[PDB]
Design a protein around this ligand. Structure first.
Ligand code: CHL
Ligand code: DGD
Ligand code: DGD
Ligand code: CLA
Ligand code: CLA
Ligand code: CLA
Ligand code: CLA
Ligand code: LMG
Ligand code: DGA
Ligand code: BCR
Ligand code: BCR
Ligand code: CL
Ligand code: CL
Lengths: 449, 242, 61, 44, 35, 336, 238
């Protein structure tokens, strides 16, 4: 690396010194991808070594073993792990790939070519070559489309993916006839982000999940071909700033939106994030608390339909703002929650009082109580539930962990997008170092008053 | 076009940052097709021994291409529904041991019962192959009538180039231009090396799994984690790690 | 059979440690990469051989 | 029912529209602004 | 309440279209310096 | 040549000759914030009582219904609604909309859009004036804090009724309930934020003291000491060195802040990063990450629980917990 | 929508649309109303929905009138999922009785002039006697809030302070009505029904109803108003 006297960047901005050095920049990326897959493999091996089989997966502080378990690699018809060898294989393969990628990144960072155009014109690129940048973007889009179609192939033909909505309490279900309806998929992408709709978190079945994955993979492949075989239009040239920093800022804004959205998936979704592996969501364990007390107090003999709590609304059953019958407690905010242990109990008009009186399954009875106990409360130093509890149980929900961390990372990356977008605009305009002091723009403007 | 495969600045078996340009042996200077500078053992010795072994490499390459096609295609037809009766390559000889005979499937109008026995097939194969292998060294062929040139005489193989004889062996031409001829030579030697690797893979996979390569690829595409080298080396299964 | 697997994995761990220590040392040394090519290639080949050996021996152990 | 509501909340309505007139005015407003921008681009 | 929704939708669509097409209309070129 | 409608519209919006810069971010900042201002003022003056807890129990909040400036507030949306997007047209009538807390959703949504477009407008004016653009990056910290307390905390808890009430006593109520249910004082991010505002006050006092101390006689006991020269000269003579000299001699002379750019960068970054930390602490507690729980954490050799200052904080926290929304709870423990 | 087509829709198809508050109607039935031969018959799935909420407004000049009002609560009033027994005879005498189910709904309505009127729309413990054209009776009306309900300043019924604490000089006259009493005595309301549009082959009745019940007194602070509730009622009849 250089010093500050030749590059103009201090040590705390050292990665800027390799903005125009394509070979070293590539080495930084390859070593970084090695770091990411190294964390994947190492954390997978750590969670496998720290695995107790009889305990549920969410009570052990495991964040990515549920990610493999959602794919159905070694889970049973109730979330039972049975075997952890797929997890071990995944961790070992990630670690070996980390060794390979780290060797490549270190090689290009240290003794790789300094700049790529003078020796490898296919990999050489300048930031102002819009055709070359769109070529690289098309390559990565084709790669991402193949990655999405890999999950599609696994769900369709390799007998995987765990359906939590399967009768009996979820099961690894091979998916046949995914819903590839364009109106349906675009309806999920354009619906409201609020409670009634949920925008994109509210996808509730693997058929729609795999249909959307088919759509995103085909669209990514077609767009990759399109960017390889095209050049950006003049309106795009006039609208965008074409520099390596501006491209980074675009990526930063996109990945910050992705981080916020993934935080929302973690907190609310229970289909792509099954509760048997991730623990209860926000709405459930509260809906579960309202359900367990209803089924307890009707076993003791009290009429739950009479209800009439301290405010005259209902201790167990009440009416939502829309005429559907919902749970009577304060958990009338989570009245739109849908769970595998709720839907067979739920009908068109409401919660089906006749079903609440007669048809309640023991698996639902066990699941709701065990969800009520393991709420997504928890404190940051472990300990138990609400902030006023005592040192009794060691549990914090993985949904809470990777919702809080992902929101923090998304906000930081939005801040970084602001920083890099502003600096890219200032560098393209020529005043990223300061005001010119002999022709400043303010003295060329009329005073306000 | 041609600079990528010939000359000092050609594609080597290791990249520039992993292999210096003066580390190539002096007898591999990018004058032959498929020159990647790959010779870690002292087998090439000099340029004339390299040229002499090139004949063995090219003959083995063409035979390996014909091989790889002859293993993959009939087994795939037999597994997909054709009446092949012995499509698997390591057991096709056992179907003619006593009185059996292989059915020939000339697509699309296939399924024909050949009546030649094993003794007649072996005799005619040895006779024809000895004749062609003796003609290859001697460079003499009596008759003609090839699509390359109408009814060529016997005095046309003389004066030709061995290991690459044009004329009667080139019905479609497309090789008189030297640059595309050299590029196609590189294509041929690379396809031949791929075919050699493939047929060695076919033999080793057959010995390991007990089935043909088409069965191997179909079962692997059906379940890659449930059927691979790791699975076939393991046996039946293992106790789950709980 | 698992004893051979454990010895191979321990050898893989030591070879990987030697590689992690020495590859930046070989690369960033003044004209050291052009003369340590043989030892670095041998170390990488031994590492890949050990990875493949542990993988193969997993099926038998 | 003692009162009248549109009851369009929920149900995953595209862009929140419950009648075709809302989509039509959205498309018309976007088309009008786009037409003005297109015929008045490049500072004429 | 339907015509209120129509009016609000028209207003929001108008202002969002102004935002989008104004940032499309040569926005990086509005600088006092070169480029 | 700016003879077309969109050309003159762009040249007027982009123009820096306006008294207040509008810009393409201002074309959204102005109407949303004007709508929020109008609805907030009208609701604060004369809004009918709002049932916040969803238990048919309305809080007054508005001056015309009998309270003052300190205890007057625009009340968050009804608990029965949740975070369900309740605008005027989704209500049967304006009376129902006002009973169910719709003004809060309107004002909060418009305020969020307005502060986002305010960051964008700050960047836009910095770009049009040839400045460096990270003033918006500095402003992203109060925007993050307001956004986290107004929308992200309701998203985490499941209802806009968890939003901070638009008022003073409502702010105190939200803060006390937040203490009871999350132990915010026992959160390192909140500790960082408190240290950030305290250090920001410290550093503002230090910077003002060192600049106003380091002067020369240009303004006497009268309004100005212009006897040497009147207005209209470029002779800068304030001070450059003695401020850093005094700050060095104050403690140990090696805390080098002689670079004015480094000093001002520190002044900018310290409260901004600490407010970022405390805003993200609020955002994490929105998903019930809570504070440090050292309650009954000290036990003796016989295992008997020894009391602690953390235990006294726990007693105060659960005293707050049993008194919050005393009529809203039916089931024993409280889960978001 | 009838009951047959209500069961034919999924929960997601009727969520957020207000159909779940509607009562099912009878389409293929007859208006003869005299098709019910036997008695002691045990009706089920009785459900009621109002169509108007009018509040009795006694002025201070001496005449009686009801006024149209505006609802503040959303579609959370309404009666569903409750059963009972009906003893209908051959001559036409009808003995109505409702025992259990979701037989109440807390409703807040706004008078003209901006006065909040909360009430508990109840039909619980209702016995109805009369013919097919009109049978009426009385039903129990709970207060509104339970005995553990706490007002703004503690106080409450069963639980609380029983005085306004943040005023040390208290517990005297003009406050006993607000502090000491805190009455939760149940009231009674009278409703009149009517049967029309009966289905014979499956037993369905869906007529209209008119109910009069007292409003909420909070905890006895102010005297109750009277709420007139008119609307449709439906019940499966098996
Ligand atoms: C030139 C390469 C060649 C190769 C690699 C093999 C390979 C094989 N032949 Mg084979 N053969 C070959 C040529 C020939 N075979 C035969 C005739 C047979 C017979 C009759 C049989 C084999 C069989 C076999 C297998 C076991 C020996 C197998 C490994 C045996 C087999 O299939 O066992 C299952 C077997 O029975 N071969 C003839 C004469 C037509 C050949 C002429 O070139
Ligand atoms: C200048 C100089 C340099 C200065 C640097 C300063 C910056 C950083 C310094 C380090 C910061 C961390 C210090 C504390 C580390 C620690 O004490 O380590 C803490 C723990 C302690 O280890 C074990 O932690 C366990 C935690 O239980 C876990 O497992 C349990 C079951 O076993 C339960 O399932 C429970 O839910 C689950 O949380 C138990 O408490 C064990 O007893 C305990 O030994 O280690 C761990 O986990 C380590 C966690 C790794 C990092 C995770 C980052 C957080 C990621 C997401 C959350 C984001 C939150 C944002 C808001 C805040
Ligand atoms: C403009 C005015 C403000 C707009 C606020 C938008 C709030 C979005 C929201 O309410 O977010 C939540 C929604 C999800 O909503 C939930 O979606 C849920 C989906 O679950 C449903 O489906 C699940 C899967 O089957 C389960 O079945 C579950 O039971 C079922 O209910 C339900 O619908 C819930 O009712 C509903 O609460 O996620 C999402 O919108 C994902 C989109 C990302 C939201 C990010 C919020 C923070 C954004 C910026 C912060 C920084 C800003 C800059 C600062 C400087
Ligand atoms: C994701 C982390 C990351 C990565 C991948 C990089 C990568 C890189 N940085 Mg950088 N940097 C980082 C973080 C990172 N940095 C941080 C946090 C700071 C602030 C402190 C800096 C500050 C900084 C400056 C000031 C400079 C760089 C420079 C560089 C480049 C070349 C380094 C060099 O030329 O000297 C050689 C460095 C070494 C010889 C020491 C590294 C030792 C090895 C390579 C790493 C450890 C060995 C590893 C485990 C081996 C793996 C074994 C394998 C077989 C599995 C390089 C691509 C230089 C540059 O910009 O290029 C012009 C430069 O001057 N960085
Ligand atoms: C972002 C990935 C990436 C990119 C763009 C490059 C690009 C480049 N590398 Mg390089 N390399 C990489 C990763 C990458 N490398 C990794 C991970 C390793 C460690 C094995 C290496 C090790 C390496 C060496 C030793 C050398 C290069 C060299 C070069 C340059 C010559 C062209 C070439 O491809 O050489 C050839 C590289 C290979 C043949 C690597 C094998 C790639 C195969 C075909 C896999 C195909 C990818 C496929 C889609 C699967 C992706 C992984 C999947 C699991 C996700 C070139 C600019 C040469 C150089 O620097 O010139 C001076 C050279 O000496 N690379
Ligand atoms: C300290 C850094 C850090 C760490 C440790 C993590 C860790 C994690 N992140 Mg994360 N992230 C970070 C930073 C970090 N992140 C930052 C800064 C951002 C920007 C704000 C994000 C944004 C982000 C998003 C948007 C998401 C995560 C997610 C995740 C979790 C799963 C990772 C994953 O699989 O992604 C994906 C891995 C890849 C894309 C690599 C491609 C390989 C694919 C997966 C292969 C296909 C698999 C195939 C089907 C297997 C079948 C085999 C086949 C043969 C049949 C994981 C625990 C995910 C999550 O769980 O949501 C909360 C997720 O959605 N993160
Ligand atoms: C993948 C996203 C990404 C990428 C590729 C870059 C790339 C770059 N950034 Mg940047 N940045 C990002 C995200 C990113 N940034 C985000 C999200 C923020 C907001 C926090 C910033 C804020 C930022 C600033 C203020 C600056 C840069 C700068 C730079 C350039 C030089 C970096 C350097 O060598 O500094 C050296 C790296 C370090 C000294 C290490 C940083 C240590 C951090 C600050 C502490 C936190 C790390 C800790 C372990 C995590 C704690 C948990 C977390 C949730 C808080 C470089 C091209 C500089 C620049 O503008 O150059 C033109 C610069 O001034 N960035
Ligand atoms: C910054 C950080 C951003 C972080 C995260 C962003 C999260 C989500 C991103 C948007 C997801 C939703 C996509 C659109 C959905 C939609 O339009 O729903 C449309 C919604 C729903 O509309 C409602 O829908 C209900 C049914 O669900 C009912 O029908 C209601 O009557 C109806 O009004 O209305 C809106 O919220 C539109 C708000 C428009 C705000 C525009 C701001 C533009 C600002 C700048 C210009 C940018 C370009
Ligand atoms: C409820 C359904 C929900 C899903 C539907 C969502 C539809 C969203 C489609 C938007 C995609 C358009 C991309 C243009 C972006 C700006 C391009 C530009 O910088 O454009 C500028 C560029 C400059 O060169 O010009 C050009 O290349 C011209 C290219 C722009 C194409 C013009 C759009 C068609 C115009 C139709 C007018 C509508 C007229 C009014 C209808 C009235 C009906 C009553
Ligand atoms: C897979 C999946 C799925 C699917 C999904 C999807 C399909 C999505 C999508 C989506 C889409 C389809 C998107 C799109 C987009 C775009 C964007 C997001 C953009 C942007 C940008 C911007 C922001 C702009 C800016 C600007 C302006 C404003 C103007 C001027 C220029 C500029 C640039 C400045 C589902 C869920 C179903 C299922 C599950 C899974
Ligand atoms: C350049 C540079 C840089 C960067 C660096 C890096 C990033 C590196 C890396 C790297 C990497 C990324 C690596 C990786 C790796 C891996 C490895 C080395 C591995 C391995 C292996 C083994 C040996 C294993 C074993 C095992 C198994 C198999 C399982 C079980 C467990 C055990 C462990 C036993 C820095 C920042 C310094 C500075 C600047 C410059
Ligand atoms: Cl509750
Ligand atoms: Cl409270």
């Amino acid at each position: 690396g250089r010093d500050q006297e030749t590059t103009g960047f201090a040590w705390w901005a050292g990665n800027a010194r390799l903005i125009n050095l394509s070979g070293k920049l590539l080495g930084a990326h390859v070593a970084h991808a090695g770091l990411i897959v190294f964390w994947a493999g190492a954390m997978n091996l750590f969670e496998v070594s720290h695995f107790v089989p009889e305990k549920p997966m969410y009570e052990q502080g495991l964040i990515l073993l549920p990610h493999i378990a959602t794919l159905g690699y070694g889970v049973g018809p109730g979330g039972e792990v049975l075997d952890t060898f797929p997890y071990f294989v995944s961790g070992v393969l990630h670690l070996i790939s980390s060794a390979v990628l780290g060797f490549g990144g270190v090689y290009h960072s240290l003794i790789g070519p300094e700049t790529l155009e003078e020796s490898y014109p296919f990999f050489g690129y300048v930031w102002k070559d819009k055709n070359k940048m769109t070529n690289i973007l098309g390559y990565h889009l084709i790669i991402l489309g193949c990655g999405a179609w890999l999950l599609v192939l696994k769900a369709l033909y390799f007998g995987g993916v765990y359906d939590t909505w399967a009768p009996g309490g979820g099961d690894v279900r091979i998916i046949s006839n995914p819903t590839t309806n364009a109106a349906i998929i675009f309806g999920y992408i354009v619906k409201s982000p609020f409670g009634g709709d949920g925008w994109i978190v509210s996808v509730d079945n693997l058929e729609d999940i795999i249909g959307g994955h088919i759509w995103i993979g085909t669209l990514c492949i077609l767009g990759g071909i399109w960017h390889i075989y095209t050049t950006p239009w003049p309106w795009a040239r006039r609208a965008f700033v074409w520099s390596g920093e501006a491209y980074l800022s675009y990526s930063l804004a996109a990945v910050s939106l992705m981080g916020f959205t993934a935080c929302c998936f973690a907190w609310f979704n229970n289909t792509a994030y099954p509760s048997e592996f991730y623990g209860p969501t926000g709405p459930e364990a509260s809906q579960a608390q309202a359900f367990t007390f209803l089924v307890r107090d009707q076993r003791l003999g009290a009429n739950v339909a009479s209800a009439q709590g301290p405010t005259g609304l209902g201790k167990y059953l009440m009416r939502s703002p829309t005429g559907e019958i919902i749970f009577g407690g304060e958990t009338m905010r989570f009245w739109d929650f849908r769970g595998p242990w709720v839907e067979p109990l739920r009908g068109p008009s409401g919660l089906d009082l006749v079903k609440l009186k007669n048809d309640i399954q023991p698996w639902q009875e066990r699941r709701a109580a065990e969800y009520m106990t393991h709420a997504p409360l928890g404190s940051l130093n472990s300990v138990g539930g609400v902030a006023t509890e005592i040192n009794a149980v060691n549990f914090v929900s993985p949904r809470s962990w990777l919702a809080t961390s992902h929101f923090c990372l998304g906000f930081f990356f939005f801040v970084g997008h602001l920083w890099h977008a502003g600096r890219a605009r200032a560098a393209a305009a020529g005043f990223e170092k300061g005001i010119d002091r002999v022709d400043e723009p303010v003295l060329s403007m009329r005073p306000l008053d | 076009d041609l600079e990528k495969w010939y000359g000092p600045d050609r594609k080597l078996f290791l990249p520039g940052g992993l292999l210096d340009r003066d580390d190539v042996p002096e007898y591999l200077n990018g004058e032959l097709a498929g020159d990647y500078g790959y010779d870690p053992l002292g087998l090439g010795k000099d340029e004339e021994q390299v040229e002499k072994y090139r004949a063995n490499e090219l003959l083995h390459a063409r035979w390996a291409m014909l091989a790889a096609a002859g293993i993959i295609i009939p087994e795939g037809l037999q597994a997909n529904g054709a009446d092949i009766k012995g499509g698997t390559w390591f057991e096709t000889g056992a179907e003619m041991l006593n009185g059996g005979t292989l059915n020939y499937f000339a697509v699309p109008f296939g399924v024909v019962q050949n009546p030649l026995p094993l003794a007649a097939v072996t005799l005619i194969e040895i006779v024809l192959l000895g004749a062609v292998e003796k003609f290859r060294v001697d460079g003499t062929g009596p008759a003609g009538f090839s699509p390359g040139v109408g009814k060529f005489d016997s005095d046309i193989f003389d004066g030709l180039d061995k290991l690459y004889p044009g004329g009667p062996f080139d019905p479609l031409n497309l090789a008189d231009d030297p640059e595309v001829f050299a590029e196609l030579q590189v294509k041929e030697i690379k396809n031949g090396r791929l075919a050699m690797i493939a047929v060695l893979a076919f033999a080793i996979q057959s010995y390991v799994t007990g089935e043909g390569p088409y069965a191997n690829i179909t079962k692997h595409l059906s379940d890659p984690f449930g059927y691979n080298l790791l699975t076939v080396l393991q046996g039946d299964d293992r106790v789950p790690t709980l | 059979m698992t004893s051979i697997l454990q010895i191979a994995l321990l050898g893989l761990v030591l070879v990987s440690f030697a590689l992690v220590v020495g590859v930046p040392v070989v690369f960033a040394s003044p004209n050291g990469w052009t003369e340590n090519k043989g030892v670095v290639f041998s170390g990488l080949s031994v590492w890949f051989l050990l990875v493949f050996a542990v993988g193969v021996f997993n099926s038998f152990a | 029912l003692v009162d009248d509501r549109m009851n369009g909340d929920g149900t995953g309505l595209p862009f929140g529209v419950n009648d075709g007139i809302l989509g039509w005015v959205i498309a018309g407003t976007l088309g009008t602004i786009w037409a003005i921008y297109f015929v008045s681009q490049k500072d004429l | 309440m339907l015509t209120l929704k129509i009016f609000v939708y028209t207003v929001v669509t108008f202002f969002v279209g102004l935002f989008i097409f104004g940032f499309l209309s040569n926005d990086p070129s509005r600088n006092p310096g070169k480029g | 040549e700016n003879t077309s409608l969109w050309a003159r519209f762009c040249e007027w919006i982009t123009s820096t000759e306006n008294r207040l810069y509008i810009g393409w971010f201002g074309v959204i900042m102005i109407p949303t914030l004007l709508t929020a201002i109008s609805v907030y003022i009208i609701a604060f003056i004369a809004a009918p009582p709002v049932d916040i807890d969803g238990i048919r129990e309305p809080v007054s909040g508005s001056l015309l219904y009998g309270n003052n400036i300190i205890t007057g507030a625009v009340v968050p949306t009804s608990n029965a609604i949740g975070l369900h997007f309740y605008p005027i047209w989704e209500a049967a009538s304006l009376d129902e909309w006002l009973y169910n807390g719709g003004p809060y959703q309107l004002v909060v949504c418009h305020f969020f859009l307005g502060v986002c477009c305010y960051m964008g407008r700050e960047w836009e004016l910095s770009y049009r004036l040839g400045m460096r653009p990270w003033i918006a990056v500095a402003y992203s910290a109060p925007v993050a804090a307001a956004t986290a307390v107004f929308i992200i905390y309701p998203i985490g808890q499941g209802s806009f009724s968890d939003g901070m009430p638009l008022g003073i006593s409502g702010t105190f109520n939200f803060m006390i309930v937040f203490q009871a249910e999350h132990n915010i004082l026992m959160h390192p991010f909140h500790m960082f934020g408190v240290a950030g505002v305290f250090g920001g006050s410290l550093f503002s006092a230090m910077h003002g003291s060192l600049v106003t101390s380091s002067l020369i006689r240009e303004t006497t006991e009268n309004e100005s000491a212009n006897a040497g020269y009147k207005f209209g000269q470029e002779e800068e003579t304030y001070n450059i060195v003695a401020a850093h000299g005094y700050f060095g001699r104050l403690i140990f002379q090696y805390a080098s802040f002689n670079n004015s750019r480094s000093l001002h960068f520190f002044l900018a970054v310290w409260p901004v990063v600490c407010i970022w930390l405390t805003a993200l602490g609020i955002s994490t507690m929105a998903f019930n990450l809570n504070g440090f729980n050292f309650n009954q954490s000290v036990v003796d050799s016989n295992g008997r629980v020894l009391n602690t200052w953390a235990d006294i904080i726990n007693r105060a926290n659960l005293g707050m917990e049993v008194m919050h929304e005393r009529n809203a709870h039916n089931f024993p423990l409280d889960l978001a | 929508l009838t009951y047959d087509e209500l069961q034919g829709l999924t929960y997601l198809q009727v969520k957020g649309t207000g159909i779940a508050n509607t009562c099912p109607v009878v389409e293929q039935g007859t208006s003869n109303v005299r098709e019910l031969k036997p008695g002691d018959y045990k009706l089920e799935k009785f459900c009621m929905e109002p169509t108007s909420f009018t509040v009795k407004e006694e002025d201070a000049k001496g005449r009686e009138e009801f006024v149209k009002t505006k609802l503040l609560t959303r579609l959370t009033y309404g009666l569903d999922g409750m059963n009972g027994s009906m003893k209908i005879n051959n001559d036409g005498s009808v003995e109505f009785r409702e025992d259990e189910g979701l037989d109440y709904a807390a409703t807040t309505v706004k008078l003209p002039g901006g006065e909040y009127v909360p009430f508990l729309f109840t039909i619980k413990e209702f016995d109805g006697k009369g013919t097919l054209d009109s049978f009426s009776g009385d039903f129990l009306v709970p207060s509104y809030r339970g005995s553990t309900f706490l007002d703004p300043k503690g106080r409450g019924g069963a639980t609380g302070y029983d005085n306004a604490i943040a005023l040390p000089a208290k517990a005297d006259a003009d406050e006993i009505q607000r502090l000491n009493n805190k009455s939760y005595t149940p009231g009674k309301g009278s409703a009149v029904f009517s049967v029309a549009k009966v289905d014979t082959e499956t037993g369905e009745i869906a007529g209209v109803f008119e109910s009069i019940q007292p409003s909420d007194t909070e905890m006895g602070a102010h005297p109750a108003k009277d709420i007139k509730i008119t609307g449709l009622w439906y019940g499966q009849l098996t």
